[PDB]
Design a protein around this ligand. Structure first.
Ligand code: ZR3
Ligand code: ZR3
Ligand code: ZR3
Ligand code: ZR3
Ligand code: ZR3
Lengths: 276, 276, 279, 278, 278
């Protein structure tokens, strides 16, 4: 809505990305956002201040300011935030935890000791929300009203893809779209090295490799076609592309990306289990 | 311009992509485009017909129709097209070869036997022009007027990134952004397999992996930051993402993408050398 | 049927595995009588020569008698034997002959070069088929030579279509076809033996494991041939999230399973070009 | 000339396997499509959309499927089975044959659930695969404690109309799942790659796919109709010094055989984990 | 207390190496920035933008650099050198020392070009690296046919103000290029990865980078100031049974040493190819 007030506990990379995306989208006004942080000298904190986001060192102040309260701290800090500000949670509050692995149940258990029906949502988003091309899923807690999930989808749809999921899919989403941008950054660096190796200036190589990945992903999102079909479409017989595809297969390219999604998903499960 | 008439020799994947992108951009009207093909029953030919592109089985007819003439056939077919329609090339014609590896000099040599100052351009684009997110470079030939390169940049900028390069960079661009989308499609298929392996429905996994790659590439294009810095930004200490990055490094992920750009670039050079 | 009543005489120079497989498929198809086939071999002690005799095929040690008997003459000897064969019986090739080379790598040009020294317009077709013609499920391509009539190509297609898939190609595709469907059955036999080993490792009787593995590959291949779907889409449709199949696909990927099959198709194709160049 | 005039078939679950069996059974002529009913909690699936075109009755309510059906196929994920069995267990009748198609789920676990509601549930466990859609499936089945002799023969009759089918001891089914249950996906992966190889060497993609699939089909048929060892058939294609034996060498150098062994094992091992997780 | 009052330095090329040497020389106090001139065909480079902030004279015309300069550094790509030498060869004077910094390009090829215009060109070939920007470069040089004794001593004086510098025989320079020319990039890659390792084990990225870089700097210093073999110094850190020897084992298992040998060789081999291509 318009009257809506949003707060972040955590003023790191994710909070900045979300706030910058929300304000760019126009769904939120920077002055309706407050962030708190233990280190008020972070680079991300300075930038929020230029954007017009309110800033404080006191999580309690962010809570009293906020209607929607995003939890954007590390997983092992979540149990402490909840103990710190659990008494300050009111009926009007929707708590949106963005921490990897941390379960709705563990958040509801800590918060229920203060007030009995805390409205909790768990989400997994990623940094490209900063350019309003994020990928976000969310699961609704026990006491989240029906309007809570819809308000959440409205807000996070404005900065990229958003869809509701069962909570037991979120650990796998973390390995895929949560960690995904880092796989892409690693890939682009390497593709740029390849271009440079074959004679391209670095800056041209980075722009071309990025544009290639962006356009390809866009083609897949705008197509009903399987990605192998689109690969077929662009692999001319005997040509350059099919030769490059072979050397990727020879190194087990596909299995490395499977390994990655699996490794991130399994680590996310450990971050949960380490909580309880 | 508006009066401009464009033709394609070749009605395959690339011709459709370019025509669909040009018409979507609004820089060209479908009725100002003509394509010719030896197999008038191709799926890409049927689609051009629905778009309103004129179609013919006679390359000579496309040439007489066209002011800008795109050559969108396989590299070993180019020498035959030029022999077929070389007498039909007029002063007003700009010949834009999109074939991998085929040099401006080889095109100018064949065409100069008919008329002495053929205006030739070599380009390397990719299929994401279909969603107006292509990556394109071009080099100007000996007799291309100054307005020719600018008209070309105007047209191809409307369907994605475009920049002029020295011709000796084009073989490396082919390995990077020419073959790039196929690396991305392979990557997305594998990332989807990873998501499915960890419990996601296939359709959700494909959408999330694609959105992740798109958003990440967009972040890099909108940033002055090095891709390793953006990787740093999203690799939380001890977290899921840094664990996945390790297993990518353990398989030599980076070197496989370097291998690919190199293999495609080297194959492109063979496709040229095989001509001469 | 229409071909049966054409009452064609067929010859094989070379009485090996392919000659036997084609003879067995043509007769099973009812398009040729076994005794309307004649095959020659310098070695009449091969097992395939005995199998051919048993089914009623005529056998002779003299290639000239095969040629004189034949209307369609299949050259089914090793590539390096082809030029010696053409020297020997080039004088006996007649204007009525359609000469079909099945040898890997050997080009129409090289065959026509030899035979043009005798009659001026040898009718030559180059073929790449495979041994599952023996169960009428072969995979065949052919290219027509310089003097091959349009009816020659249609007849060859009608004949090879009776024992499986058959289609005309430009000759410059045949080396690649050899690497794919010419050698393909051997890739599948290796895969079926390995899958059976896997089933036995996990506790299945060998007989059952072999049966199930082969039935699994047959049905998947049949699904693909009857679907308009990409094989990756079919793979997606069978890969239940979190399930047994996606876990097995991972271990395939981790060994570069896909690259091995690409490697094999390339290695057979490359070898096929060497077999031409060495003779 | 088989046909089951007195049999009503139901599917709990309207996914890829349900569509494949329903399509195979109707193409085999053994069942009128309108004598099939399927249920699913997402009546917006592509498979549920195709089932309506066939004429299969579709409902959202699993209780409706059970009441309509004699033979009831459980074609849902292994972890959904215990919930299904709780939901409809009070609707299982003496006439019902329950045929579970879920990977890993034992006859014992299914009978334990249903016996709470009514003693002597007639349970069969089967492992089939999607090529039943072209009547070339590979199916095994094991009969439960209270399945009658006519129940197994009947299920063999029905599933034999869509491919190979034999009875097995239940403790072989996890291994069958790794071989023929997952097998078609190994083949689709192999055909994608073989086609990639054909394209590399210069073939059009469409021809490469056709030829690769034809090669595999014909080789599988040869083995099925031959009494000979697959190594013997491989020997018959491998001309001395030739192209095939050179390619076979590069498969061996990659450990191609061990990868397929690895696959059957991993799928089998995972199937056992799907039992114990539920 | 070194300073070259009578020396005018010019750079043909205004890229990373030109900026690094110009910055090192000015920080060393040996050259006023305004006594440096650099030329480049793209006066829109980030390096050319930084050079103007230093006070270095910048021109687009290579002829201007030559006329301003006594010591002329060729800091362009190897394939550009022959074009540069054709463009300005008629402007080379007796007073000029030409110092080529291009990988691979021999003294012989440079002298052949310039001798067409004027006999006895004074040519020095050097291989340096970008840490000259922090006065810790590693530089070798070889003197040409017509370089006087004072020319080499002078160039050693100048480049010693920004790091290690020694004269070598020219046929060692390709190998030096693979070791110290490319070396810093091996180190940047190693520091990125070591930091990735620190982050994996729970350190903030900024601390991990700092500590990794400090570790490397301190180890390099230890070796430089020790007479001892690097294996001996490694032995001194590897406490029996401890953390370091366990990590060293995993480096050995990956063939870590051979990768660095591979790198020096590949860079050296490529450097020789850059000579022969031009
Ligand atoms: O994979 C190839 O070899 C390839 C082929 C082309 N095209 C399009 C039309 N004619 C060509 O050569 C473009 C880019 C690549 Cl990278
Ligand atoms: O790499 C990680 O472990 C990771 C961490 C997060 N965030 C952001 C704020 N708190 C978190 O846990 C989100 C996604 C991932 Cl994939
Ligand atoms: O890949 C799996 O895990 C798998 C899953 C199934 N199905 C179908 C319906 N319920 C199941 O479990 C069957 C065979 C396999 Cl091999
Ligand atoms: O493995 C080979 O080299 C091979 C050999 C043949 N034949 C049959 C008769 N003469 C040949 O060359 C056919 C197919 C292949 Cl794939
Ligand atoms: O390699 C080790 O295990 C190690 C050991 C030590 N020291 C010094 C005295 N006692 C220790 O444990 C310090 C650092 C490391 Cl890295």
């Amino acid at each position: 809505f318009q009257s809506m007030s949003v707060g972040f506990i955590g003023a790191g990379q994710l909070a900045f990305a979300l706030a910058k995306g929300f304000t760019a989208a126009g769904v939120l006004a920077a002055h309706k956002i407050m962030a708190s942080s233990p280190d008020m000298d972070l680079a991300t904190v300075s930038a929020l201040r230029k954007m017009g986001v309110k800033l404080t060192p006191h999580n309690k102040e962010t809570v009293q300011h906020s209607d929607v309260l995003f939890l954007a701290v590390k997983p092992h800090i979540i149990p402490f935030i909840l103990d710190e500000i659990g008494a300050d949670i009111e009926d009007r509050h929707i708590v949106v935890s963005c921490a990897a692995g941390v379960t709705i149940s563990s958040i509801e258990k800590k918060l229920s000791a203060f007030r009995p029906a805390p409205r909790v949502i768990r989400c997994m988003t990623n940094t490209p929300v900063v350019v309003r091309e994020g990928a976000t899923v969310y699961a609704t807690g026990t006491h989240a009203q029906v309007e809570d999930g819809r308000l959440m989808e409205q807000l996070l749809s404005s900065v990229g893809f958003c869809t509701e999921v069962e909570e037991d899919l979120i650990d796998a989403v973390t390995g895929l779209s949560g960690s995904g941008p880092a796989y892409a950054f690693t890939a682009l660096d390497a593709l740029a090295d390849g271009g440079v190796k074959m004679g391209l200036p670095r800056r041209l190589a980075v722009r071309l490799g990025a544009q290639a990945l962006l356009g390809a992903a866009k083609m897949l999102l705008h197509s009903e076609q399987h990605p192998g079909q689109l690969k077929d479409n662009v692999s001319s017989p005997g040509g350059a592309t099919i030769h490059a595809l072979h050397v990727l297969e020879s190194g087990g390219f596909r299995s490395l990306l499977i390994n990655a999604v699996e490794a991130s998903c399994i680590r996310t499960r450990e971050l949960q289990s380490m909580a309880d």
